[PDB]
Amino acid sequence: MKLNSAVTASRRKCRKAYFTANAETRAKMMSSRLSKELRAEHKIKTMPIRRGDIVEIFTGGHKGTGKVVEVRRRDYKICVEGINQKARNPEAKPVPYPIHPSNCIIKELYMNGSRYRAIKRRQERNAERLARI
Amino acid sequence: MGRNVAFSNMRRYKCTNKGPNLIKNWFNQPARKIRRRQTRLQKAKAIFPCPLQKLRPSVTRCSQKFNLTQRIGRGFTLRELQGVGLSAGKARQIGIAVDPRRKNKSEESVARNVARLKEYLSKVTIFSKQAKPEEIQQAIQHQGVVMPVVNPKPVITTGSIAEAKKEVPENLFMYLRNARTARNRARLAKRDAEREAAAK
Amino acid sequence: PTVKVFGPTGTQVAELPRPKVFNVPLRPDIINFVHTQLRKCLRTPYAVSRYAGVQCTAHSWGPGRAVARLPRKHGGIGAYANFARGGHMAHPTTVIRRWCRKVNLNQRRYAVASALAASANAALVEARGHRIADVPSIPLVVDTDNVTKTKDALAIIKAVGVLRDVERCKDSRHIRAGRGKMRNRRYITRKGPLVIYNTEDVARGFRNLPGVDLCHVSSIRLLELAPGSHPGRLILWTKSAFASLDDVYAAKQNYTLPRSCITQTDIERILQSDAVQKTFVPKRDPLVIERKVDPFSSKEALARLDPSGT
Amino acid sequence: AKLKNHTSKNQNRKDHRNGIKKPKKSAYTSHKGMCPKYLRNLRRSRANDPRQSLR
Amino acid sequence: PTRIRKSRKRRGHRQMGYGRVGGHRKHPSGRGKAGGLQHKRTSFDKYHPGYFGKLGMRNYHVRRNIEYNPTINIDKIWSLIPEEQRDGFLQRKSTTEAPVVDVTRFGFFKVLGRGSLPQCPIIIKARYFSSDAEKKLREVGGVPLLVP
RNA sequence: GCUAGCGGCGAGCGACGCGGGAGGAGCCCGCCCCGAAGGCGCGCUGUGGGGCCGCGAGGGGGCCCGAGGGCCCCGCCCGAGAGGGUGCAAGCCCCGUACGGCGAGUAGCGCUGCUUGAGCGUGCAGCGCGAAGGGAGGCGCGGCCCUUCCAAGGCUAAAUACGCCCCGGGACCGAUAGCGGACCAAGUAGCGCGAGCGAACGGUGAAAAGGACGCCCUGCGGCCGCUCAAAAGACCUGAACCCGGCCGGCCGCCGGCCCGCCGGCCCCGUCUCGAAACACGGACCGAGGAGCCACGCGCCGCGGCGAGCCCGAGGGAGCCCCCGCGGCGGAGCGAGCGCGAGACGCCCCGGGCCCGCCAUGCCCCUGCGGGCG
């Protein structure tokens, strides 16, 4: 059970948080498990999804691997490259099938310079936790 | 519907829908206890060695219905204070409440309260001349009424029938009855004496 | 008699004298009354608003407009009436309802004791839905030094045979039917072991286990003792708690435990005793009712009534 | 305006429904309205010998 | 509560137990105990004798503590003695050492004589005593005594 | 406690002292003394002194499905099995959760008016009059005491009350309900000269994939089918009333029979002596729609305890645990002064006797008092 009474277990209040979250919270909420190779490399279980990330969806329709090309935060869904809806005619624009970030596992990350710093910041806080918090 | 119904002494509800709000709900009871404990805990922390409650006197409960019981009163009289040789300032500074309004009303009250002060003065320890932290931390805050007043439970003593017989008149009931009616028996006598003067 | 104490590995460790509370007469009706009154005390107040249905300005149009006589607004929309849409309730709920019932200390102390007596009764504990097949004894007392890890707590539960009950709770997790889901009561899990502790930090270890509730001996809760107003919760007593049960009752000041009474089994034996049987006298033979027949037609039927004539 | 002034119909039936109740047994022996002197003598007479419950 | 009530069993019955000829109307007999000397005189006379009028001297402020006089009986004096103490007192008799019971300490002011003291000298100390109290107390051998 | 009192002493109304707690804390000015030492452009007509931040555990294989979060096998993490999300019901997919870190025009009195339970006056107030030792003690007036205080100047924490707004929770309501208002614009749209009044309207899908292509159209648009698990196509489910196509049948209810014949059959609700009534309400259908709650009293049952009994308010790093006063009962009766119950008895009724109130004898102490009748 939860001993911090300051937090809410109300279905209505919690759902409002998800539906109406600030962008900075929406981004963390949209996170995906790193692959076991990346877990050994960066020593972090999950990273928030970015645009340039190779991802393997283990979902039911559209299971596959792809690089994210669009992150739609308002719908809370990401669009990898490759995974698309069936096209009515061959001569038509391909529509990406929106996939939940939770339905996919990251295979490669866009390291940037802020992402390197963020992995370091988390690694330090995780080490302090591992030292008997 | 009727039959034999004791009649109601209940008053009709006033300001039921419009007015001052004459309804007090007590859902705030569990949480008022919590708030009051916290206020006491925080005040207690603010003065660790000092007890929250000041010494207050043992006073007879007022009225003939509670004459032989004692309760805690607002503060010590200045005569009780002179029995321990303490000024009102010094007494308050060492946590003994002082009431300059109270007058003892009996020799017994001064002695009972003077005794109670002596117990407190021996119990009180004054931390002065630089706060030795380990010794101030070592000190234990007293919690609750300091020296709570105890009303001893009644006990059955033993006596000689003969000594008691000397103390009371025979026909105590007549003696008691003569006393209850004395003023009336004298007023009727004074009235009868005037009715006699009428003959002359 | 004595109660066997078991170790964390399920081996016998010591024998503890049975607390006298377990002999208290088992009274289901006292448990139900106190549970009902006490659960009502844990209710939160609900009420419709005082201004509900009455912020409209509605006055009756009256007789003579071929309408009904109820209060109507400016356009003739019906208002201020239980039947009307947007009208006040006929008798609006109020927060002044008595939510908490009152129980005397003596009966609120009989309920706990009788519930504990039911816990000593394996038959009642099986009927409450617990899996008691592997539990070595009921009541069960287990030595358990502070357990700060759920994995270790489960290992003691597996050894003492309470695990099947802990599993029956885990598997039970489901979504409740109704608006209970919407109103923060979404998941229902069956209730199972109860761990009563003293002088131990076994709480950190058993808290996450599913269906297990933990209480200190000093403050035992009837609602936990009799979940559903049904006596017979499986209680895992820690050696310290069960050996202090008599001290808790002794420190209940001027309280004498309800004197034990006879059971149904003991009154059948007493009725079956020879002394009662000697008093029994054999009842007089009953009337033979039979059924009407026409005697005149049959020689034999007349013969029952008129032997000579036939 | 005008309604029935009086009727007796059914009143006998209503009386006999469970009625015609005899008047107690204590009433037949009560000392209410008896001669104050005779009653004093009775008390003095029954206050002597076996009848006496004076102790 | 609500489920096990009579009004739940009156559904489908229209009037709800109040009658077709005269139904539940608001305040048919009036509001309150109004009508005592007029329309409801039969009730206020049959069951409320003494309701109307004035009967005594009026004290503007009764002093509840001067008025309070608690009473004991010659029969309950010995229950005030602790049980372990009472048996020894009963066998010894002890005119020399008989148990003085200050009823004032136990909360009582006047000693009445409802029943009967055991036959052992006692000594009772009280503000006041009845007549048949002192007679019963002194027959047992005890002395009525007054306490400040 | 809710009584004492008040009240066409009617209906009604109504404090307080005790006692138990929460919380506790005391003081100043005038007067008088000094006099400018003061807060010094003043002032001797008197100043001054006496919370944020932060990590965060552990799941696979098969079947099947549009999609597991399902089913079957088998593990793992639990100081975390509160919850929220994710394509179906997820402790281990994600977010989180548990575990952290840094005293005078006065009092009073007279007359009047308002007010109070305050009763020859509870508190006020106008006016007239106006003290010096004075106020109070719940029946006025005059005397004499006793207890107990010092008005006509001022300050003061705590315990206490409470909306907006923020935060949590609920045996609450679930779109005619719940705020009037869940709908990206509700005090809006609209109405009134104005003060003011005041609605209705939730839900496609997992994803807009929101309709491929062919055909016929002057075109509108039809068709075929397409996307989808499904059109779910401007939207979830899609009822009843009502209606149209086809398709039987001849027509209401009840009873018999193969089933269209025979037999029975007024329109309900309602007041009412009496309704098919030419009494009233009711076109139809759907939703909503009326003895609930508080408090007081009577009585009944039941549970605990028993001359007792009692989660009062409260207090216990404790709120289902512990501790915890009045009260009520145990003695009545009388306007009161006051006085004050035993003699029996399964139970019930009655009689007898005792207690109070009222009378009457008789005897006597400590006497308009005690005893006995």
DSSP-derived secondary structure for B57-107: -EEEPSSTTSTT-EEE-S-B-HHHHHHHT--HHHHHHTTB-B-SS----SH
**B29 backbone φψ class: left, alpha, beta (φ>0; ψ -120 to 50):** alpha
- Nucleotides on strand F lying under 7 Å from protein C-beta: 1-6, 9-27, 54-58, 65-68, 77-87, 89-91, 93-101, 117-119, 138-139, 148-149, 159-162, 167-174, 176-181, 187, 190-191, 196-200, 206-213, 226-229, 269-273, 288-298, 303-305, 308-324, 330-331, 335-344, 349-353, 355, 365-372
Cβ contact (<8 Å) for B23 and C96?
yes
DSSP A93: P
Q: How far apart are the first and last CA of chain D?
A: 72
Q: Which residues does chain A have within 8 Å of residue C181's beta carbon, measured at their own beta carbons?
A: 11
Closest nt to residue E30, judged CA to C1': F11
Q: Where are the alpha helices (DSSP H) in chain B?
A: 29-46, 78-84, 88-93, 107-123, 133-138, 161-167, 172-197
**E63 backbone φψ class: left, alpha, beta (φ>0; ψ -120 to 50):** beta
**Which of C135, C100, C113 shows the shortest CA–CA distance to C225?**
C113
The approach used to solve this structure was cryo-EM
Q: Does C176 touch chain A (CB under 8 A)?
A: no
HEC assignment per residue over chain C: CEEEEECCCCCEEEEEECCHHHHCCCCHHHHHHHHHHHHHHCCCCCCCCCCCCCCCCCEECCCCCCCCCCEECCCCCECCCCCCCCCCCCCCCCCCCCCCCCCCHHHHCHHHHHHHHHHCCHHHHHHCCCCCCCCCCCCEEECCCCCCCHHHHHHHHHHCCCHHHHHHHHHHCEECCCCCCCCCCCEECCCCCEEEECCCCHHHHHCCCCCCEEEEHHHCCHHHHCHHHCCCCCEEEEHHHHHCHHHHHHCCCCCCCCCCCCCHHHHHHHHHCHHHHHHCCCCCCCCCCCCCCCCCCCHHHHHHHCCCCC
Q: What is the resolution of this structure in A?
A: 3.2
Contact, C305 vs C295, CB < 8 A? yes
Q: C135: buried, middle or exposed (CB in 10 Å: 19+, 13-18, 0-12)?
A: buried
**Which of B181, D52, C33, E81 shows the shortest CA–CA distance to E90?**
E81
Q: Would you state the structure tokens that stand for residue E112, as one six-digit string?
A: 């009445």
E contact chains, 3+ CB pairs < 8 A? B
Minimal-distance CA residue of chain A relative to C179? A11
Contact, C208 vs C166, CB < 8 A? no
Q: Does C41 touch chain B (CB under 8 A)?
A: no
Cβ contact (<8 Å) for B168 and E141?
no
Q: Which residues contact C230 (CB under 8 A, 6 or more apart)?
A: C127, C128
Q: Which amino acid is at B8?
A: S
Q: Which residues contact C232 (CB under 8 A, 6 or more apart)?
A: C118, C119, C121, C124, C125, C126, C127, C128, C130, C226
Q: Does B152 touch chain E (CB under 8 A)?
A: no
**Which of E113, E114, E127, E125 shows the shortest CA–CA distance to E68?**
E127
C50 Cα to chain B: minimum distance (Å): 9
